[PDB]
Amino acid sequence: MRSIARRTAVGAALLLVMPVAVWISGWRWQPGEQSWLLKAAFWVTETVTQPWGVITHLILFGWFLWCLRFRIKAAFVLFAILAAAILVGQGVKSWIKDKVQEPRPFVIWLEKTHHIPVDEFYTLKRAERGNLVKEQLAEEKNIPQYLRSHWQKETGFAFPSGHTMFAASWALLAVGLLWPRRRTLTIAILLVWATGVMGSRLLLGMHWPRDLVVATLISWALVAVATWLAQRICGPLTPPAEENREIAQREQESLEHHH
Numbered sequence: 001m002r003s004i005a006r007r008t009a010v011g012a013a014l015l016l017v018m019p020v021a022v023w024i025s026g027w028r029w030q031p032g033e034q035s036w037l038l039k040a041a042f043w044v045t046e047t048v049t050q051p052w053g054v055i056t057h058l059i060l061f062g063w064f065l066w067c068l069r070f071r072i073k074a075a076f077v078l079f080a081i082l083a084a085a086i087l088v089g090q091g092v093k094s095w096i097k098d099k100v101q102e103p104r105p106f107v108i109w110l111e112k113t114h115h116i117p118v119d120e121f122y123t124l125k126r127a128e129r130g131n132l133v134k135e136q137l138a139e140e141k142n143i144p145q146y147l148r149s150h151w152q153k154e155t156g157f158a159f160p161s162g163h164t165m166f167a168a169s170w171a172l173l174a175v176g177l178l179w180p181r182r183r184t185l186t187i188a189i190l191l192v193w194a195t196g197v198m199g200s201r202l203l204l205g206m207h208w209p210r211d212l213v214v215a216t217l218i219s220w221a222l223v224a225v226a227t228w229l230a231q232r233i234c235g236p237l238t239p240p241a242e243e244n245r246e247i248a249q250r251e252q253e254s255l256e257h258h259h
């Protein structure tokens, strides 16, 4: 298959490692973590959560346009196609709001502590059920207000990781499009970041590693499709000859600099 999508596949693999591992190790979320880690995880999570998350995406978008400038037309198309998918994804989202029942990790601990049997809990109206989680939270004094709210906002229904799809996609677009452009500092950061985000989902008890693997995989799918359209529509995203001699120039300019 194509060279651009070989690299996205390697990314998809790399991002699968952490969550597949943790899945295999059979680790489950318990409460009472060191609260610096909860907060640091919260911020990492927050770098994608919609209040502050718009900054990240704009800066990346911008930066990506900057890096992809020799194919700037191709890039705008590509980002349009993803802006579309986001809005499709928001159409898709609304349909799921009543379908999901699988609980988030923190819900399990929460029903243990309130001595509600697994049996009764799931023999409830989906709505009455998810409300009782919402009401049970605001009576718990155990957890700090910033997490309680997030748990309330998230609702302890294991909706697919929006946080991971976004973060992972960015990092897949990096290895995908920028690897030949020597954007080694970029790529690296986004991989670390994406995984930090995945890991932060686990630390808050928002998701199970299956979810992150699905989320990662959706991204691999989506990115590979979006890039293909942009390729078929607007021609290659791979650097042209003008781009290479500029790159190959900067290599030899750095070695010859010492002289």
Ligand SMILES: CCCCCCCCCCCCCC(=O)OC[C@H](COP(=O)(O)OCCN)OC(=O)CCCCCCCCCCCCC
Binding pocket: 048, 049, 050, 057, 061, 079, 081, 082, 083, 084, 085, 086, 088, 089, 090, 092, 093, 096, 159, 160, 161, 162, 163, 165, 166, 169, 170, 218, 222
């Ligand atoms: C030609 C059209 C192709 C058709 C493809 C249709 C795409 C459908 C794939 C999504 C289906 C997954 C189900 C789902 O629940 O998605 C909704 C997801 C949830 O978002 P939450 O509000 O829960 O999360 C808040 C924190 N972001 O919110 C989402 O964001 C889902 C979409 C994720 C895509 C983003 C990846 C690209 C990001 C790169 C930056 C964008 C730059 C503008």
